[PDB]
Protein: dnaj protein
Organism: Escherichia coli
Amino acid sequence: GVTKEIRIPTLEECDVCHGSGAKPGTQPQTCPTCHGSGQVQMRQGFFAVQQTCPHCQGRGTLIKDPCNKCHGHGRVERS
Ligand SMILES: [Zn+2]
Ligand SMILES: [Zn+2]
């Protein structure tokens, strides 16, 4: 019983979305804003420094299509 019902919480990557968050096969959409590099270049003329892209929370990837299994998060508690 307890042998199968392994009631000892642990996190697992959603293998189905390969731990990302986008539906299987349907990979996360490369954030164009930061050219998939996770950082936007604040090209205010000379001072062309960068900022973390908020749109994709610096991950450079947009969960356009959320992996239902993990509600687009990308990882879940073993269950
Ligand atoms: Zn998933
Ligand atoms: Zn981005």
